[PDB]
Each structure stands twice: as structure tokens, then as C-alpha cells.
Amino acid sequence: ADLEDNMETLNDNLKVIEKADNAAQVKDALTKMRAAALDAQKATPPKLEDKSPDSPEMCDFAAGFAILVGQIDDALKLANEGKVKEAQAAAEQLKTTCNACHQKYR
Ligand code: HEM
Ligand SMILES: CC(=O)Nc1cc2cccnc2c2ncccc12
DSSP states (O other): OOHHHHHHHHHHHHHHHHTOSSHHHHHHHHHHHHHHHHHHTTOOOGGGTTSOTTSHHHHHHHHHHHHHHHHHHHHHHHHHTTOHHHHHHHHHHHHHHHHHHHHHHO
């Protein structure tokens, strides 16, 4: 799918997680987020459309999703262990990465 749709998924499932009642819900939402981060990792954002795929900017962009997915995995680990509150905490930490990239390239 496309960037906007991916970012919607990221955003919706982040809310789902803040409101979550059980670990399956969280798991499920993180899994969806993961699939979206990996998709967005392939995209070229409007801001960077004139830039070489090679460029420091494009690499930085993709790296942000590498970090995001990494963190999502840490959150998934906790959710699989059924630590709901800790997984919710972890997902809140995601936001700094969302923001960091948004400032540069959104
Ligand atoms: C889980 C954390 C994140 C959340 C919750 C989030 C959410 C969003 C949302 C709601 C939008 C508005 C898009 C729209 O509907 O028009 C957006 C846009 C955008 N975000 Fe994220 N995002 C996250 C992580 C990231 C990361 C890590 C990057 C960079 C690596 C990034 C890059 C962008 C860019 C380039 C846009 C502009 C899209 C466009 O102009 O079409 N986001 N994001
Ligand atoms: C940020 C960066 O250096 N990107 C890439 C740079 C590349 C430079 C030569 C050949 N392939 C790539 C490449 N292939 C897949 C995905 C990313 C790259």
C-alpha cells in the first residue's frame, strides 16, 4: 500500500494499544504496525522525491523505520510474555521515533 495508508495504520493501532484490554489486542495491533512500517520503509516521501535513493536523506528515512520496527519487536516480546502495561509503555516510546522522522521529512 501507500505512505498515507501506512501512516494511518501506524496511528490507529497506536491508539488501539493505548486503549487495549488484553495482550492479544496489543499483539494484534503491533503486528499490524510492523507490516505498515516495513511497507513505508520502501516508499519515497513527497519531501524527498527529487533525491537520489542513495542520498543521506533517503537512507536516514529508511533507517527510521529500521529503528521503529526494532522497537515494535521489543514491544511484541513484552506482549507475548503477557506484560500488557510494559508493552503499552514500550509503544508510547515509539512516538519519539515517529516525531523525529516527522520533523525531518513530513
Ligand atoms: C508509530 C509512529 C508514527 C506514527 C504514529 C505516524 C503517524 C503519521 C500520521 C498520522 C501521518 C499523517 C499522514 C496523513 O494521513 O496524511 C504521518 C505522516 C508522515 N509520516 Fe509518520 N508516523 C509514525 C512514524 C513515522 C516514521 C518513523 C517516519 C520516518 C521514518 C514517518 C514519516 C512520515 C512522513 C514522510 C509523512 C508524510 C506523508 C505524506 O506526505 O504523504 N512517520 N505519520
Ligand atoms: C540508503 C542506501 O544506501 N540505500 C541503498 C543504496 C544502494 C546502493 C547500491 C545498490 N543498492 C542499494 C540499495 N538497495 C536496496 C535498498 C537500499 C539501497
